[PDB]
Symmetry: C3
Subunit: 158 residues, 3 copies
């Protein structure tokens, strides 16, 4: 049994994240999407909305479950009893910070493995930040996100 | 005929940008400097000042025009009837942030080409950000910017 | 004699910083830890606290001294009569955010050399920012900082 925790802010969840979750749900027995509160990013969407949006996008995947959390990731992953961290790697990705994240979480949670997947090339350039900014200026983002997300964004700036 | 759009925050426009603009004006029939409002960056200079500085620095180039805009770039490029995006490439900052911007703008403006130029090595290391912070602490920034920009920075903090 | 300045925000100082400083004290007659006020970052700890923590961690090194400053680095280095800047370099920390920093300071303080050291691999991944957030969520950070630093973070968040 592998249980994998996919942590992120998901503000909002994109077609990029969803590609990864598709792939991960076919690989693992249990996939948990851990949506972090991330109060210091001043997220456009509330935690509840983000969790809700992530659930909507993933409701067709039976072994995928979505949860919000605002505690320390190293604590939370033990608390979820996941044995694997999942992260995506696309652009760079940032690649500094991913390694800095992995080695520091490995000191705090030594029995949890850090693992990476890369999205389909066709979604490797979708940024949550820029999806938000395109929406805030009235641009079509239907090609970057799930329909429910596109709608939540439209109604967010109206 | 080619009409080229060089979008940026230009806060302020630096000798790096000016180098690029000299080179681009020499290559294309029409070059438009599109100065983005970029409110999420809290620019030191107002859009109107930034545009004014960009005009001052480029007024000697007859095929160069300066416009401010606060809409979606993918919209604006159309209303400007430009067929090419210009961006600078150097450092590089994040060589993918440019790949990521081009690629989703390729999605919003399929008919506009993304193009890159590089400034002279002698200007390859000037950061608008560090120009602002150096100026803010009373450091001499005349070596990084056009004289008119240097006056604006001096008077910006007094 | 060489006198070398190690500038940084140090919010707080880490075992990463401390390793570099250790390596620098064996190399140079005089090492100055210049803690920048850095108000644009809103530091968790005040300049005075950060200065104190750096003193505590380095007080056993007789040729190492700690100074706080809120002026321009290119100016302050002249006030300290140091001829060398020290910066750390561990994996794409900020790629050439160090080189543009170096070359822009080369314009402001031409008689001062920029020099880099890299920390022991065991400290190549410690992030001040991530230490702050782990501490804010009650995680153990003793693997990342000196005990005195570990003490100060606990009292900061209770
Ligand atoms: C795992 C974790 C630490 C990573 O946080 P994070 O990378 O900053 O946020 P995410 O994981 O959701 O992914 C970051 C996305 O948002 C961007 N981003 C990162 N920091 C950002 C910030 N302050 N503001 C806006 N956008 C940011 C990134 O560029 C990235 O992609 P994007 O360009 O498409 O927007 C996060 O899940 C978290 O905060 N967990 C719990 C709290 C915790 O344990 N902190 C200590 C970490 S060891
Ligand atoms: C070109 C464009 C699209 C991207 O903007 P941008 O590249 O981030 O801003 P710039 O063009 O000036 O280039 C990056 C500069 O902004 C600075 N910058 C980036 N984020 C910053 C921030 N939060 N705060 C302060 N400065 C910031 C960078 O420091 C960099 O300058 P520097 O490296 O010399 O320090 C911009 O003109 C724009 O946002 N246009 C319209 C809005 C839009 O369409 N957004 C959707 C994007 S697809
Ligand atoms: C030498 C100097 C410039 C270094 O600046 P700095 O590298 O950004 O700050 P630090 O030295 O503490 O090192 C970077 C640390 O702060 C982070 N950081 C860098 N820029 C940041 C920013 N805008 N906001 C928040 N954190 C930032 C880095 O990521 C790193 O933290 P980390 O451990 O989590 O990775 C410092 O002396 C300074 O900031 N100012 C001196 C006054 C001056 O002359 N400024 C103009 C410099 S040209």
């Amino acid at each position: 049994m592998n249980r994998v925790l996919y942590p992120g802010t998901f503000d909002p969840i994109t077609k990029g994240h969803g590609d990864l979750i598709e792939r991960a749900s076919r690989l693992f027995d249990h996939v948990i999407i851990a949506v972090a509160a991330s109060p210091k990013k001043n997220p456009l969407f509330s935690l509840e909305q983000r969790v809700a949006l992530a659930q909507e996008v993933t409701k067709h995947l039976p072994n995928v479950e979505v949860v919000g959390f605002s505690t320390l990731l190293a604590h939370f992953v033990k608390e979820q009893k996941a044995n694997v961290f999942l992260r995506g790697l696309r652009a760079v990705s940032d690649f500094e910070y991913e390694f800095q994240l992995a080695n520091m979480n490995r000191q705090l949670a030594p029995d949890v493995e850090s693992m990476f997947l890369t999205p389909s090339e066709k979604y490797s350039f979708i940024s949550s930040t820029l999806v938000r900014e395109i929406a805030a200026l009235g641009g079509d983002i239907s090609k970057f996100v799930h329909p429910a997300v596109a709608d939540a964004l439209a109604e967010r700036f109206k």
